[PDB]
């Protein structure tokens, strides 16, 4: 009855604040509601804003355009329709799974990860050092030498 909705490039790998044109090609005429999905959360209504969401109706086609796209806009986009055909047969589109790309030149990511690995190894070493410092210092402060008087393996322990 009302299941002839069309869509456009779905994956749409884009950089932050880029431009693509959406539409809602259909073979019917009725009430329309844009919806946005992120992750597994429930469908939610979209709110129009000038220069951020452009809504021009080309007759049976409902053009859409999203500027200033950020990471919060990652998810699935589609346009609903209302089919008041005495049976509440409510149909929907299929989807447009937008993605936001990390610009790490696909190469600096390796350098950053290697650096953080260095720093948390430095954590291991320094934290061991600063946990052995207080006890070995209060032993001298309170007043090691006794153990030596009482071999290399014991010293390591």
């Amino acid at each position: 009855p009302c299941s002839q909705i069309w869509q456009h490039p779905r994956f749409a790998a884009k950089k932050r604040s880029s431009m693509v044109k959406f539409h809602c090609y259909t073979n019917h005429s009725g009430a329309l509601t844009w919806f946005r999905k992120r992750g597994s959360q429930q469908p939610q209504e979209l709110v129009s804003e000038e220069g951020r969401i452009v809504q021009t109706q080309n007759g049976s086609v409902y053009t859409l355009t999203i500027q200033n796209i950020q990471y919060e806009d990652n998810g699935i986009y589609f346009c609903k329709q209302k089919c008041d055909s005495a049976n509440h047969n409510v149909t929907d589109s299929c989807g447009t799974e937008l993605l936001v790309l990390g610009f790490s030149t696909l190469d600096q990511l390796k350098r950053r990860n290697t650096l953080k690995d260095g720093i948390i190894l430095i954590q291991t070493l320094l934290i061991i050092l600063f946990i052995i410092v207080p006890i070995f210092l209060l032993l001298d402060k309170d007043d090691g030498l006794n153990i030596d008087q009482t071999e290399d393996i014991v010293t390591l322990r």
């Binding site: 456009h8 490039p9 299929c94 690995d117 210092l137 001298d140």
Partner: protein, 142 residues
């Protein structure tokens, strides 16, 4: 008189790793087809693939390649009734193979902040120990 689940709108897979598609439908055992295409309006008709395997109609690419990016929509025929799916999208990304350093940006940067806080505190406390020691040894000498 019938519907079909659209499946994932997009899909990701590592290069050289198997990618399996899907076509879920309410039919009993009804005719299924794979019609590969491209993103937008090109000058070529959709390229039909093989017939799939199993009752579901699942594709299989044992060694996928970079050339396999594009839509993969499944065609279902059920007693002279036609219905079009939506279409997936294969793609390769070659992710990061280095899991040693506690995978998760938030994880590593959070433990970095914890590094700063704990290192500063565990350096400050030795200062208190040192001043206490100095006072006690000065008392000892006197």
């Amino acid at each position: 008189a019938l519907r079909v689940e659209g499946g994932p709108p997009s899909l990701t897979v590592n290069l050289g790793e198997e990618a399996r598609l899907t076509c879920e439908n309410n039919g009993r055992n009804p005719n299924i087809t794979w019609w590969f295409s491209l993103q937008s309006n090109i000058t070529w008709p959709p390229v039909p693939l093989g017939p799939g395997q199993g009752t579901t109609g699942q594709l299989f690419f044992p060694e996928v390649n970079k050339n396999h990016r594009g839509l993969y929509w499944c065609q279902v025929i059920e007693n002279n009734i036609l219905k079009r799916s939506c279409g997936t999208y294969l793609r390769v990304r070659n992710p990061v193979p280095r899991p040693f350093l506690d995978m998760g940006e938030g994880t590593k940067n959070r433990i970095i902040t914890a590094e700063g806080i704990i290192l500063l505190f565990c350096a400050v406390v030795p200062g208190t120990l040192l001043l206490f020691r100095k006072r006690w040894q000065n008392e000892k000498f006197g």
